[PDB]
Amino acid sequence: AFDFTEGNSALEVIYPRVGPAVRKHINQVAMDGTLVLRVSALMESSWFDATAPYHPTAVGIHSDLGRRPASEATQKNLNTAMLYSTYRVMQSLMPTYDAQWREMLTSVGLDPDDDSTDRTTPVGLGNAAGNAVVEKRENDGMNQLGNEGGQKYHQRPYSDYTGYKPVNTPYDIRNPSRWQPALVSTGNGIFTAQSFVTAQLGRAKPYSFADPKDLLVSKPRSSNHRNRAAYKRQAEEVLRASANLTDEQKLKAEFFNDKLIFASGFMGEISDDLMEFIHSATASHIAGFDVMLASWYNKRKYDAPRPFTAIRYLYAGQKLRAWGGPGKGTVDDMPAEDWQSYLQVSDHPEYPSGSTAFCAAQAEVGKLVGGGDRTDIRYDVEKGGSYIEPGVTPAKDTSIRWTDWNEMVDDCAKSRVWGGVHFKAATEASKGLGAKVGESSYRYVQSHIEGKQVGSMR
Amino acid sequence: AFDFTEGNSALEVIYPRVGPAVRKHINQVAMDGTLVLRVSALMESSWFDATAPYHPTAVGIHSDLGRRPASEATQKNLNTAMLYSTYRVMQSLMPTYDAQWREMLTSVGLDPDDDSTDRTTPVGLGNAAGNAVVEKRENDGMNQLGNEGGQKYHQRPYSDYTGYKPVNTPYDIRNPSRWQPALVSTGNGIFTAQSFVTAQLGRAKPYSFADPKDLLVSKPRSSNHRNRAAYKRQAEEVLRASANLTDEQKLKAEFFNDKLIFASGFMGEISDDLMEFIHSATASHIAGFDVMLASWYNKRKYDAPRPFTAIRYLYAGQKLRAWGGPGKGTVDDMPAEDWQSYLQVSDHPEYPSGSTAFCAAQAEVGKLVGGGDRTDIRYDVEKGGSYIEPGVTPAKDTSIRWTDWNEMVDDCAKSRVWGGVHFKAATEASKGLGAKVGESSYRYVQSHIEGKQVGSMR
Ligand code: VO4
Ligand SMILES: [Cl-]
């Protein structure tokens, strides 16, 4: 029931199956940007590579698959290349979802046992393109296969092979100027301590630049607790934002915090030309992948503490005015040792903000695609639809709209402070960081579009 | 499709629903004894109190609910009382399964909104009995409500309020004489450190004795890493068990490691008389709850290291002849820092063995109820039905049978060493512990059946 000649296989066949799998596999809140954006970058650049011969000049990022006559550039042909290259990438990234990927193909009539690599057919181009992405990314340094350092047994995808250790335990703040893992429980009586997710990411191969070394942000000096005044001030800002939350801040925090929810507000930016959609989506999420890698390089270098670690340190034995938790509204007697961010604070150091650097990179790419600051980004949440306070937030039906790329970025920054997971400085540093990677990935893909292979993916 | 006059509530209506809910909520492997056995003891002791008025002399544990004419001691009325007590206990322990517990009652024709407490009706007796269990057990020191210590906000069920902290880190063995959390991943890209599950349990209120502190087991002198000779030998045992695993060892390890699959081996041990079934279950799983509690008191007291910790310390930098991981059979090049137990090692200190102490308790109640060492424990697994090596173990359909309670207890104790999760010493200590607790639970239940209230559970 999909129209190869007129539909968009991404929006109608691929996304409806890959989004849910990602939530089922990784996290119900699509919160783990280095995992979801690896899927996102790898899948969609495989679209770019699988359909490059149907463009007048484009060459692929991971493969050089030649040229086809412009008359073969049918909607059906692009769609078919897309579905097969997705198939190979997802079979590499999420093998335990083998059945789901086969069904992705068979539900639209294609055969998942067709492993042809004929560069004259859209199935061969899809297969060749997806296999090339998989061959170039399985051992890119992120440890997708848990084999780095010659590990033959008990392989765990994306395990850290680089020996990162935190200097605080989840139970003792030994160093308030350094990251501390949070103790977390889903509510079933099991408790676990966070572990720096994809701590090795900083060593993985980027797309649009050679080394994250050259995207170093400045030291987060307000997070040096010996700078007593600036350290206490940013913590006071996080407590005020917590104490003063509005429904709209809560939701804007929830929006920018879930990458799938975030992308779902973009259906007003989508071109009607399939090739255009592919080229924009490739630059967008190559920017996302690369900015996450730059963010994680920075995050590991500075190893900065999340707000709760500062609030616990500064306000020990005290009771704070803050958000009281689901359905409690603001309270005056939050014990500092129980205080939580509104959002669940993620499993990595605080500085800078990965979500914000992805917002900024995406807006940089957005501007370069549409020529100006104009956009149309939308989020609609029914009464009680919040995923932090279901049944309480928002109190009434809510529509949030952005029409300027910059104001959206600014809100995304603000929202991590409202969310409780970042100090102001992290979000500010991520604006310039995202801007740079978003332009560099735009120029990287645009070069390839224009027939110029650049970089070292091949 | 349930016959109130001839069927069994537990086996036909309740267990097929509570079991799968316990797997969804807590763990696909029913391996977290302190939470499974809380559900087990509280549900079934609620049965015992629901139906005690229908026995000529029985008085309840958490309530005194009077006496019913012998003419009313019908199967129909027992089942009805069981279902309503269960309803109130599950609504307390697992409130997010509201729809499941409601459907548990509507599916055999009962109104989940019947509030009645009329002690002349099976409905009111069930409600009253379950309400009493709930009122006595919500604030028993297990911190089910997350409220201990006056915590009003961000309540997490069963969170520790007693300040347990490990002296080891997931990433560094400061002290090989003390417990170390494992770093664990579901295959997800996400990684978390274990936290001592229900570290507070030693403080909670037991059934059949006042205080676990009178139930201490011997000092584990071989888990002291400076007593070098003895420390090494027991690690060497665990390695040799790992290297020399066989399909039957593997399957017994799995059998005693999953509390629900263990309970599945007891089919030829159910009474036909429904009242007799409630009384044996109550003795059995009050025995389990009380041996969990005493085990945890000892685990916390001794804070002993798991085998993987000692192996990593002793054989740092070497390769080992061990189990290679799923489908790998035995290999000679397992790096020490990669060695894992066959079972997934549990999130609590090593000494003594909770599963064995449960096995030993369950076997003691079975003796006192059955008149001696004779029993009928069966466990069948189709080819490839392992949950550690799905599709590899076992080769060939396998049947395992125990006829002697003591044989079963020795196999459980041995299975934890085959499993890689315990040293021998911990599994031997649990025998004396489980015998004592199983006995005191049986005598504690037996007194209540006979009409003599004992203890402080009212
Ligand atoms: O549940 V155990 O204490 O035998 O690892
Ligand atoms: Cl900067």
PDB file of C-alpha atoms in Angstrom, chain A residues 183-380:
ATOM      1  CA  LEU A 183      22.118   6.481  40.561  1.00  0.00           C
ATOM      2  CA  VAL A 184      19.016   5.611  38.509  1.00  0.00           C
ATOM      3  CA  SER A 185      16.004   3.299  38.788  1.00  0.00           C
ATOM      4  CA  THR A 186      13.035   2.802  36.498  1.00  0.00           C
ATOM      5  CA  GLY A 187      10.783   2.117  39.492  1.00  0.00           C
ATOM      6  CA  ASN A 188      11.038  -1.687  39.708  1.00  0.00           C
ATOM      7  CA  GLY A 189      13.344  -1.778  42.752  1.00  0.00           C
ATOM      8  CA  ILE A 190      16.522  -2.192  40.645  1.00  0.00           C
ATOM      9  CA  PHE A 191      19.077   0.601  40.910  1.00  0.00           C
ATOM     10  CA  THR A 192      22.071   1.194  38.641  1.00  0.00           C
ATOM     11  CA  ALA A 193      24.806   3.781  38.392  1.00  0.00           C
ATOM     12  CA  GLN A 194      25.315   5.635  35.105  1.00  0.00           C
ATOM     13  CA  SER A 195      28.323   4.968  32.903  1.00  0.00           C
ATOM     14  CA  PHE A 196      29.803   7.484  30.438  1.00  0.00           C
ATOM     15  CA  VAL A 197      27.973   6.494  27.265  1.00  0.00           C
ATOM     16  CA  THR A 198      30.183   5.979  24.200  1.00  0.00           C
ATOM     17  CA  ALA A 199      33.084   7.582  26.089  1.00  0.00           C
ATOM     18  CA  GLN A 200      35.255   6.423  23.161  1.00  0.00           C
ATOM     19  CA  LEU A 201      33.248   8.502  20.660  1.00  0.00           C
ATOM     20  CA  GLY A 202      35.911  11.236  20.584  1.00  0.00           C
ATOM     21  CA  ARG A 203      38.324   8.814  18.881  1.00  0.00           C
ATOM     22  CA  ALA A 204      35.914   7.771  16.104  1.00  0.00           C
ATOM     23  CA  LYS A 205      36.406   8.990  12.532  1.00  0.00           C
ATOM     24  CA  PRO A 206      34.471  12.186  11.730  1.00  0.00           C
ATOM     25  CA  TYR A 207      32.921  13.010   8.374  1.00  0.00           C
ATOM     26  CA  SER A 208      33.313  16.741   7.750  1.00  0.00           C
ATOM     27  CA  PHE A 209      36.628  17.401   9.541  1.00  0.00           C
ATOM     28  CA  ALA A 210      39.773  15.484  10.405  1.00  0.00           C
ATOM     29  CA  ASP A 211      40.036  15.917  14.184  1.00  0.00           C
ATOM     30  CA  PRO A 212      37.748  17.033  17.033  1.00  0.00           C
ATOM     31  CA  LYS A 213      40.903  18.629  18.589  1.00  0.00           C
ATOM     32  CA  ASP A 214      40.106  21.599  16.352  1.00  0.00           C
ATOM     33  CA  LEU A 215      36.594  22.013  17.784  1.00  0.00           C
ATOM     34  CA  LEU A 216      37.708  22.464  21.383  1.00  0.00           C
ATOM     35  CA  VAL A 217      35.458  24.877  23.286  1.00  0.00           C
ATOM     36  CA  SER A 218      36.802  26.903  26.199  1.00  0.00           C
ATOM     37  CA  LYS A 219      37.231  25.358  29.628  1.00  0.00           C
ATOM     38  CA  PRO A 220      33.973  25.503  31.634  1.00  0.00           C
ATOM     39  CA  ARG A 221      35.472  27.711  34.281  1.00  0.00           C
ATOM     40  CA  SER A 222      32.274  28.349  36.244  1.00  0.00           C
ATOM     41  CA  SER A 223      32.251  24.610  36.908  1.00  0.00           C
ATOM     42  CA  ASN A 224      35.562  24.921  38.807  1.00  0.00           C
ATOM     43  CA  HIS A 225      34.242  24.867  42.356  1.00  0.00           C
ATOM     44  CA  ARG A 226      37.274  26.895  43.518  1.00  0.00           C
ATOM     45  CA  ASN A 227      35.635  29.748  41.555  1.00  0.00           C
ATOM     46  CA  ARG A 228      33.176  29.769  44.434  1.00  0.00           C
ATOM     47  CA  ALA A 229      31.050  32.663  43.259  1.00  0.00           C
ATOM     48  CA  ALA A 230      30.593  31.637  39.598  1.00  0.00           C
ATOM     49  CA  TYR A 231      30.149  27.982  40.630  1.00  0.00           C
ATOM     50  CA  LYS A 232      27.399  28.840  43.114  1.00  0.00           C
ATOM     51  CA  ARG A 233      25.729  31.326  40.734  1.00  0.00           C
ATOM     52  CA  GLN A 234      25.111  28.836  37.902  1.00  0.00           C
ATOM     53  CA  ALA A 235      23.685  26.349  40.449  1.00  0.00           C
ATOM     54  CA  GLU A 236      21.371  29.117  41.717  1.00  0.00           C
ATOM     55  CA  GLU A 237      20.260  29.587  38.108  1.00  0.00           C
ATOM     56  CA  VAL A 238      19.409  25.896  37.802  1.00  0.00           C
ATOM     57  CA  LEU A 239      17.434  25.990  41.050  1.00  0.00           C
ATOM     58  CA  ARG A 240      15.487  29.079  39.993  1.00  0.00           C
ATOM     59  CA  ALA A 241      14.648  27.574  36.606  1.00  0.00           C
ATOM     60  CA  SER A 242      13.529  24.430  38.459  1.00  0.00           C
ATOM     61  CA  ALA A 243      11.498  26.410  41.014  1.00  0.00           C
ATOM     62  CA  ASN A 244       9.861  28.535  38.290  1.00  0.00           C
ATOM     63  CA  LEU A 245       8.961  25.991  35.603  1.00  0.00           C
ATOM     64  CA  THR A 246       6.005  26.676  33.326  1.00  0.00           C
ATOM     65  CA  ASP A 247       4.156  24.053  31.301  1.00  0.00           C
ATOM     66  CA  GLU A 248       5.675  25.566  28.164  1.00  0.00           C
ATOM     67  CA  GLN A 249       9.205  25.313  29.545  1.00  0.00           C
ATOM     68  CA  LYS A 250       8.493  21.740  30.618  1.00  0.00           C
ATOM     69  CA  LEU A 251       7.349  20.804  27.114  1.00  0.00           C
ATOM     70  CA  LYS A 252      10.103  22.691  25.298  1.00  0.00           C
ATOM     71  CA  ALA A 253      12.530  20.760  27.502  1.00  0.00           C
ATOM     72  CA  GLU A 254      10.732  17.509  26.594  1.00  0.00           C
ATOM     73  CA  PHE A 255      10.728  18.420  22.882  1.00  0.00           C
ATOM     74  CA  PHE A 256      14.434  19.166  22.466  1.00  0.00           C
ATOM     75  CA  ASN A 257      15.304  16.265  24.750  1.00  0.00           C
ATOM     76  CA  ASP A 258      13.828  13.485  22.528  1.00  0.00           C
ATOM     77  CA  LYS A 259      15.558  13.341  19.111  1.00  0.00           C
ATOM     78  CA  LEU A 260      12.659  11.511  17.480  1.00  0.00           C
ATOM     79  CA  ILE A 261      10.108  13.935  18.921  1.00  0.00           C
ATOM     80  CA  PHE A 262      12.387  16.781  17.829  1.00  0.00           C
ATOM     81  CA  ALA A 263      12.621  15.572  14.219  1.00  0.00           C
ATOM     82  CA  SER A 264       8.814  15.070  14.154  1.00  0.00           C
ATOM     83  CA  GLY A 265       8.338  18.835  14.454  1.00  0.00           C
ATOM     84  CA  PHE A 266      10.156  19.309  11.115  1.00  0.00           C
ATOM     85  CA  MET A 267       7.481  18.083   8.694  1.00  0.00           C
ATOM     86  CA  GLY A 268       7.056  21.707   7.503  1.00  0.00           C
ATOM     87  CA  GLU A 269      10.668  21.828   6.206  1.00  0.00           C
ATOM     88  CA  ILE A 270      10.428  18.702   3.996  1.00  0.00           C
ATOM     89  CA  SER A 271      10.878  19.180   0.260  1.00  0.00           C
ATOM     90  CA  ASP A 272       8.558  17.501  -2.240  1.00  0.00           C
ATOM     91  CA  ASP A 273      11.495  16.498  -4.438  1.00  0.00           C
ATOM     92  CA  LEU A 274      12.854  13.185  -3.213  1.00  0.00           C
ATOM     93  CA  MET A 275      16.456  13.900  -4.216  1.00  0.00           C
ATOM     94  CA  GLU A 276      16.272  17.268  -2.409  1.00  0.00           C
ATOM     95  CA  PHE A 277      14.862  15.655   0.732  1.00  0.00           C
ATOM     96  CA  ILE A 278      17.704  13.109   0.619  1.00  0.00           C
ATOM     97  CA  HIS A 279      20.430  15.739   0.178  1.00  0.00           C
ATOM     98  CA  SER A 280      19.073  17.938   2.990  1.00  0.00           C
ATOM     99  CA  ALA A 281      18.577  14.980   5.304  1.00  0.00           C
ATOM    100  CA  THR A 282      22.131  13.781   4.625  1.00  0.00           C
ATOM    101  CA  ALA A 283      23.708  17.106   5.540  1.00  0.00           C
ATOM    102  CA  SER A 284      21.429  17.529   8.572  1.00  0.00           C
ATOM    103  CA  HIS A 285      22.268  14.210  10.181  1.00  0.00           C
ATOM    104  CA  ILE A 286      25.899  14.007   9.072  1.00  0.00           C
ATOM    105  CA  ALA A 287      26.060  17.314  10.959  1.00  0.00           C
ATOM    106  CA  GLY A 288      24.332  15.561  13.848  1.00  0.00           C
ATOM    107  CA  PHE A 289      26.764  12.647  13.935  1.00  0.00           C
ATOM    108  CA  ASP A 290      29.823  14.908  13.638  1.00  0.00           C
ATOM    109  CA  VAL A 291      28.601  17.405  16.228  1.00  0.00           C
ATOM    110  CA  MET A 292      27.974  14.544  18.677  1.00  0.00           C
ATOM    111  CA  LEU A 293      31.539  13.361  18.107  1.00  0.00           C
ATOM    112  CA  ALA A 294      32.883  16.885  18.655  1.00  0.00           C
ATOM    113  CA  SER A 295      30.640  17.211  21.704  1.00  0.00           C
ATOM    114  CA  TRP A 296      31.886  13.931  23.200  1.00  0.00           C
ATOM    115  CA  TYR A 297      35.512  14.853  22.582  1.00  0.00           C
ATOM    116  CA  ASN A 298      34.864  18.061  24.529  1.00  0.00           C
ATOM    117  CA  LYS A 299      32.747  16.301  27.159  1.00  0.00           C
ATOM    118  CA  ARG A 300      35.462  13.770  27.950  1.00  0.00           C
ATOM    119  CA  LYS A 301      38.256  16.350  28.013  1.00  0.00           C
ATOM    120  CA  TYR A 302      36.544  18.582  30.574  1.00  0.00           C
ATOM    121  CA  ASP A 303      34.630  15.880  32.512  1.00  0.00           C
ATOM    122  CA  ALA A 304      32.343  18.501  34.051  1.00  0.00           C
ATOM    123  CA  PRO A 305      29.724  17.898  36.755  1.00  0.00           C
ATOM    124  CA  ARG A 306      25.988  17.825  36.152  1.00  0.00           C
ATOM    125  CA  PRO A 307      23.832  20.278  38.139  1.00  0.00           C
ATOM    126  CA  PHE A 308      22.703  17.749  40.763  1.00  0.00           C
ATOM    127  CA  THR A 309      26.330  17.178  41.774  1.00  0.00           C
ATOM    128  CA  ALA A 310      26.845  20.896  42.394  1.00  0.00           C
ATOM    129  CA  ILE A 311      23.489  21.290  44.154  1.00  0.00           C
ATOM    130  CA  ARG A 312      24.249  18.322  46.429  1.00  0.00           C
ATOM    131  CA  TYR A 313      27.660  19.746  47.245  1.00  0.00           C
ATOM    132  CA  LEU A 314      26.672  23.368  47.857  1.00  0.00           C
ATOM    133  CA  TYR A 315      23.386  22.768  49.659  1.00  0.00           C
ATOM    134  CA  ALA A 316      24.174  19.741  51.825  1.00  0.00           C
ATOM    135  CA  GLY A 317      21.787  19.454  54.766  1.00  0.00           C
ATOM    136  CA  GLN A 318      19.523  22.196  53.363  1.00  0.00           C
ATOM    137  CA  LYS A 319      16.016  22.157  51.880  1.00  0.00           C
ATOM    138  CA  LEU A 320      15.417  23.988  48.625  1.00  0.00           C
ATOM    139  CA  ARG A 321      12.629  25.672  46.731  1.00  0.00           C
ATOM    140  CA  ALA A 322      12.407  23.547  43.565  1.00  0.00           C
ATOM    141  CA  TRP A 323      10.214  21.399  41.396  1.00  0.00           C
ATOM    142  CA  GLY A 324       8.940  18.647  43.662  1.00  0.00           C
ATOM    143  CA  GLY A 325       8.608  15.938  41.063  1.00  0.00           C
ATOM    144  CA  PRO A 326       5.760  14.460  39.010  1.00  0.00           C
ATOM    145  CA  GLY A 327       2.563  16.285  39.860  1.00  0.00           C
ATOM    146  CA  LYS A 328       3.990  18.096  42.871  1.00  0.00           C
ATOM    147  CA  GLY A 329       4.607  21.558  41.406  1.00  0.00           C
ATOM    148  CA  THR A 330       7.074  23.790  43.200  1.00  0.00           C
ATOM    149  CA  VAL A 331       7.797  22.972  46.867  1.00  0.00           C
ATOM    150  CA  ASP A 332       9.819  24.799  49.495  1.00  0.00           C
ATOM    151  CA  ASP A 333      11.211  21.716  51.241  1.00  0.00           C
ATOM    152  CA  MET A 334      13.091  19.690  48.593  1.00  0.00           C
ATOM    153  CA  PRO A 335      16.069  18.095  50.375  1.00  0.00           C
ATOM    154  CA  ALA A 336      19.143  18.928  48.298  1.00  0.00           C
ATOM    155  CA  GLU A 337      20.045  15.238  48.372  1.00  0.00           C
ATOM    156  CA  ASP A 338      16.763  14.328  46.654  1.00  0.00           C
ATOM    157  CA  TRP A 339      16.660  17.149  44.086  1.00  0.00           C
ATOM    158  CA  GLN A 340      16.352  15.977  40.497  1.00  0.00           C
ATOM    159  CA  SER A 341      16.345  17.696  37.156  1.00  0.00           C
ATOM    160  CA  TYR A 342      12.949  17.890  35.486  1.00  0.00           C
ATOM    161  CA  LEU A 343      14.290  15.807  32.600  1.00  0.00           C
ATOM    162  CA  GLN A 344      16.203  12.637  33.393  1.00  0.00           C
ATOM    163  CA  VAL A 345      19.848  13.717  33.442  1.00  0.00           C
ATOM    164  CA  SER A 346      21.821  11.732  30.858  1.00  0.00           C
ATOM    165  CA  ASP A 347      24.764   9.376  31.378  1.00  0.00           C
ATOM    166  CA  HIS A 348      27.681  11.640  30.402  1.00  0.00           C
ATOM    167  CA  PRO A 349      29.587  14.707  31.689  1.00  0.00           C
ATOM    168  CA  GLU A 350      27.858  18.088  31.616  1.00  0.00           C
ATOM    169  CA  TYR A 351      29.917  20.339  29.383  1.00  0.00           C
ATOM    170  CA  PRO A 352      29.132  21.203  26.704  1.00  0.00           C
ATOM    171  CA  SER A 353      25.526  20.295  25.784  1.00  0.00           C
ATOM    172  CA  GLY A 354      25.149  17.652  23.099  1.00  0.00           C
ATOM    173  CA  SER A 355      21.469  18.357  22.468  1.00  0.00           C
ATOM    174  CA  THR A 356      22.170  22.081  21.983  1.00  0.00           C
ATOM    175  CA  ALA A 357      25.099  21.516  19.655  1.00  0.00           C
ATOM    176  CA  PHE A 358      22.812  19.320  17.541  1.00  0.00           C
ATOM    177  CA  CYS A 359      20.059  21.996  17.573  1.00  0.00           C
ATOM    178  CA  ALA A 360      22.575  24.638  16.441  1.00  0.00           C
ATOM    179  CA  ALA A 361      24.161  22.391  13.788  1.00  0.00           C
ATOM    180  CA  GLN A 362      20.711  21.534  12.467  1.00  0.00           C
ATOM    181  CA  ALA A 363      19.753  25.208  12.335  1.00  0.00           C
ATOM    182  CA  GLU A 364      23.012  26.136  10.620  1.00  0.00           C
ATOM    183  CA  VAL A 365      22.202  23.476   8.007  1.00  0.00           C
ATOM    184  CA  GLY A 366      18.603  24.655   7.924  1.00  0.00           C
ATOM    185  CA  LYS A 367      19.689  28.209   7.131  1.00  0.00           C
ATOM    186  CA  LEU A 368      22.052  27.059   4.377  1.00  0.00           C
ATOM    187  CA  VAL A 369      19.327  24.960   2.784  1.00  0.00           C
ATOM    188  CA  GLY A 370      16.564  27.582   2.793  1.00  0.00           C
ATOM    189  CA  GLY A 371      18.698  30.701   2.354  1.00  0.00           C
ATOM    190  CA  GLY A 372      17.524  32.495   5.488  1.00  0.00           C
ATOM    191  CA  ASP A 373      16.587  32.312   9.136  1.00  0.00           C
ATOM    192  CA  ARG A 374      12.979  31.369   8.290  1.00  0.00           C
ATOM    193  CA  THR A 375      11.595  27.987   9.331  1.00  0.00           C
ATOM    194  CA  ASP A 376       8.400  26.312  10.556  1.00  0.00           C
ATOM    195  CA  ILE A 377       8.906  23.971  13.530  1.00  0.00           C
ATOM    196  CA  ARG A 378       5.864  22.799  15.482  1.00  0.00           C
ATOM    197  CA  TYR A 379       5.082  20.804  18.621  1.00  0.00           C
ATOM    198  CA  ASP A 380       1.560  19.955  19.787  1.00  0.00           C
TER     199      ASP A 380
END
